[PDB]
Amino acid sequence: ALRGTVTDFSGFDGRADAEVLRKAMKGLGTDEDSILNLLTARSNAQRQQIAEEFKTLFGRDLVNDMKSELKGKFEKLIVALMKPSRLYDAYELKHALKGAGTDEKVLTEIIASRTPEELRAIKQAYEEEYGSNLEDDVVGDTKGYYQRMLVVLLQANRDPDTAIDDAQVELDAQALFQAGELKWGTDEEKFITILGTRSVSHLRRVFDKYMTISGFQIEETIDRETKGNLENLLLAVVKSIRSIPAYLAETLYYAMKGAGTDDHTLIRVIVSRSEIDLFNIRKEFRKNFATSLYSMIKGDTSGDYKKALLLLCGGEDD
Template sequence: MAQVLRGTVTDFPGFDDRADAETLRKAMKGLGTDEETILTILTSRSNTQRQEVAASYKTLFGRDLLDDLKSELTGKFEKLIVALMKPSELYDAYELKHALKAGEYGSSLEDDVVSDTSGYYQRMLVVLLQANRDPDTGINEAQVEEDAQALFQAGELKWGTDEEKFITIFGTRSVSHLRRVFDKYMTISGFQIEETIDRETSGNLEQLLLAVVKSIRSIPAYLAETLYYAMKGAGTDDHTLIRVMVSRSEIDLLNIRKEFRKNFATSLHSMIKDDTSGDYKKALLLLCGEDD
């Protein structure tokens, strides 16, 4: 049975874009800034509603809401609020651009990836960018067996590794098919596919193949792990924390929270509370929702 994906942020009932715009202007006008009002409004509206508030803000005051927020806020809190205000698709594009050294707007994402990467890592990324997986239309057990055997032959049974075989199978087969392939691979080899990837590959390619496998198994579980390691240990990877919390808040953050609690014996809420501070913490906790 397919997992039902649920976010923590939904359309705010009784939404009034003009009232929100006026409240935000009041929060930033004059001496001092009412950060509490800003974070309360912007974490409780959906991204679509935030864009409507921004449009009304410009209509009412002739000012750009994002520019005003940037001028009034600072640090990690500012970065979080700015991320919330970007239209969802533009935010994803922005994050991809900044992950690429040579990334430029107006250029092809594939061209930028090719210019900034190399080898099998590059080829796996290019395959994924085609977004051309087989449709999920039922499982062919013979094909499952064939792919599992091919991966076994390409890795554990081969002197060296046939990376191309991994790239083709991981990048083009359907999600449900690959889940069955991973199970069959374990039966055939006695190893989890992740163990083979760890032994047979290294560097960026290894990280990418592991990310693909974990995402195939469960995107919420993979992102729960991403959030955990962003906060675990000395220092917090705030860029990753903001990116996942913002980009998944309307998609599957409730599912991520559930996987976080299941896999790490603590709640996402508790870890955010322990690892962040100030208005930044308050805003993240509101996005996260209740403590599990």
């Protein structure tokens, strides 16, 4: 059921494509249109081969060439599109941790919505690319229970999905009830362990049972019990447990919504998910926000940036 919007090009000719790209940048000016139309029509793996051919044919670096030709957000998008899939998330994480400050929004968004299998891969790529340990970096840049919850998640050791044990579902729902609503203060340690290590199928049942017992959806309790980064993280985990696509569709909505656009987030979610579940994200989006992702992007963005974006997204109605 998980569908992306970008797939492998049928009659792919890495060499032919490279020539088209050279021609589009050679001499005075840039044919941004041909670049944009070609790249959003190739899978990430094909973009990498195109980059290889371009280098053996011209002895020039494609990405470095595009960076000198392209400008602004269009450049940022195309550059993101050229990053190998297995390196992109690591790349975004590294840059969220970089600088004096730390972009918790990015850490929270990626660590909460990625599966353990994905976190495992992201950690390997991170280390072999930046020569640093992802966990060490996160710990060094975060504090309190927010940091603890991230580290628990980074262990990529969530319980596997097996037959649901009802007594166990009851036990956990009551535990969460006593750890929050019935407690003076909050036992965050309890929330972290349960929310961070139980299997996804188990927690979905726990969320429902928790509603029955308390009359509150777990999200309401989280909002009532916590605040700050921890709150954001816990809501992200809960939301992702329920549906990653729905969670990401929501992240997108709020990136555009307001005034102006959180282009970094808009670019990050579309590119990182283009070959995973961007189609599903499209569906959850229309259902929940009554708008088509396409129409939303088409109204908040402009220029080639907007054209490339819509081509990667697609489906005006879906």
